[PDB]
């Protein structure tokens, strides 16, 4: 009984973990890309301000 329950529960928990990982990858990739763009924009604004 125990192993049937344990194998089902692991299958269940890992399915949910893999889903949570997926949603975190998306969330982190979005944070990455906003930061990526912001860094470029900020650097350029400092360059423009120095030149003006």
């Amino acid at each position: 009984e125990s192993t049937t329950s344990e194998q089902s529960a692991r299958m269940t928990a890992m399915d949910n973990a893999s889903k949570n990982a997926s949603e975190m990858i998306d969330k982190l990739t979005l944070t990455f890309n906003r930061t990526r763009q912001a860094v470029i924009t900020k650097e350029l604004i400092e360059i423009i301000s120095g030149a003006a």
Binding site: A13, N20, M24
Partner: peptide, 8 residues
């Protein structure tokens, strides 16, 4: 918790 939940 965000990855594995509270049960771990």
């Amino acid at each position: 918790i965000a990855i594995l939940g509270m049960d771990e």
